[PDB]
Amino acid sequence: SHMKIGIIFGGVSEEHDISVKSAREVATHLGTGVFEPFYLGITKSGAWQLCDGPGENWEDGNCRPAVLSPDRSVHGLLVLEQGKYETIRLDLVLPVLHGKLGEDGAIQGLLELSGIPYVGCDIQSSALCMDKSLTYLVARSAGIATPNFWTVTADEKIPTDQLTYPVFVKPARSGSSFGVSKVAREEDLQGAVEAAREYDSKVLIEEAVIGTEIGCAVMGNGPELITGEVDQITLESGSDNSAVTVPADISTTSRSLVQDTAKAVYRALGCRGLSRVDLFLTEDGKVVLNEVNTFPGMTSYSRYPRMMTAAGLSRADVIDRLVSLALAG
């Protein structure tokens, strides 16, 4: 038998396009005798189709309508062709989705309704990590540092009185740097909030961290975790598209700290399967949390892969391991 694996991609998200790239990379790294892939692509209009494989513009490729069903008796997909339907039972879903509705908890809700095993984090962990201000809330409770931040929903005024520049303004729930601006003067503040609301009605205001931006790639369920090599940001497209150095030029102590911290958060946040912890390392040598990326970019240029690979885990290894982790109980 092969394992029929469901590979979802695309999605009604600002990161749709990256998603396609990540799914395209996945597809080239599932070896021959093991998987029988089903490429479920969600269009930017939220339409579901089963296609020949991710890439562009696969919508214009051979495409059958179909959906992941929430019915357990199906434990898979319905294929919808002109009034007639078929059912394909999957063994496992791999949700290669970034951003809104993908790392939100949205698809992890439909999945849990399916009872089908899946890769990556929970509804909970996904919710906690997409709202950066809940992540900070959790990280603090585990004794982990975080920016100093304020939160502003549609109904609240911005607390300018209280602010010390420079400042980072961001949607509370976005990624790949959509909506993020760096304000330095009061007057440039309202516009920044505005831009950020194009992406979330709830807006985050952060007091700027000084330090090097470090990134750690985590894998595992529960307590048993491994990390990749620690990366470092060197020298509008978000971090994942940034020039990095691997491994980061930092103390061996610094490195373990960075890693232990990443795992400590991953654990506190209840993460599962994988995540990419983003961190700050100040000159005093102390560590601050940025973000927890629960289903990080997996593109040929993405950070997490680069990080696992440098630690001796091939892309096919990572997928192998994520797969077994998803079926782990």
Ligand X SMILES: Nc1ncnc2c1ncn2[C@@H]1O[C@H](COP(=O)(O)OP(=O)(O)OP(=O)(O)O)[C@@H](O)[C@H]1O
Residues within the interface to its own copies (CB under 8 A): 12, 42, 45-48, 65, 67-73, 78, 80, 83-86, 101, 104-113, 115, 123-124, 127-128, 130-131, 134, 137-138, 141, 153-155, 222-223
Residue from 54, 291, 307, 323 binding ligand X (CB under 6 A): 291
**Taking CB under 6 A as the criterion, which residues in 142-161 touch ligand X?**
147
Contact status, residue 103 vs residue 294, Cβ threshold 8 Å:
yes
Using DSSP, state whether 67 is helix, strand or coil. Answer: strand
| Distance (Å, whole) CA 240 – CA 293 | 10
Which one of residues 293, 294, 299, 302 is an interface residue with Mg ion (CB under 5 A)?
293
Nearer to ligand X, 77 or 106 (CB): 106
Shortest Cβ distance from residue 233 to its own copies (Å)?
29
Q: Applying CB under 6 A, does 34 fall inside the site for ligand X?
A: no
Complex with ligand X: residue 18 or 30, whichever CB lies closer: 18
Looking at the Cβ atoms of 23 and 66, the one nearer to Mg ion is 23
Instruction: Name the token pair of 48.
Output: 């579901």
Which does residue 240 bind out of ligand X, Mg ion, its own copies, none, counting CB within 5 to 8 angstroms by kind? ligand X
Residues 6+ apart with CB under 8 A from 148: 206, 207
Q: What is the CA radius of gyration of the chain?
A: 20
Which pairing describes strands 63-68 and 48-51: parallel, antiparallel, or unpaired?
antiparallel
Is residue 69 involved in binding Mg ion (CB under 5 A)?
no
User: Which is nearer to ligand X, 71 or 186 (by Cβ)?
Assistant: 186
Cβ atoms of 6 and 42 within 8 Å: the answer is no
- Pick between residue 89 and residue 286 the one whose CB is nearest to ligand X: 286
Q: Which residues contact 170 (CB under 8 A, 6 or more apart)?
A: 132, 179, 180, 181, 196, 203, 204, 206
Q: Which is nearer to its own copies, 11 or 297 (CB)?
A: 11
Cα–Cα distance for residue pair 7/175, rounded to 1 Å: 21
Binding status of residue 278 toward Mg ion by CB under 5 A: yes
Peptide bond into 57 cis (omega under 30): yes
Residue placing its CB nearer to ligand X in the complex, 111 or 196: 196
Selected binder of ligand X within 68, 130, 180, 298 (CB under 6 A):
180
| Interface pick for ligand X out of 208, 226, 310, 311 (rule CB under 6 A) | 208
Q: Do the beta carbons of residue 99 and residue 13 sit within 8 Å?
A: yes
In sign, the C-alpha dihedral spanning 105, 111, 115, 119 is: negative
User: By the criterion CB under 5 A, which residues form the site for Mg ion?
Assistant: 175, 239, 278, 290-291, 293
Which residues of this protein are in contact with ligand X, per CB under 6 A?
147, 168, 170, 174-178, 180, 206, 208-209, 213, 238-240, 278, 290-291, 293
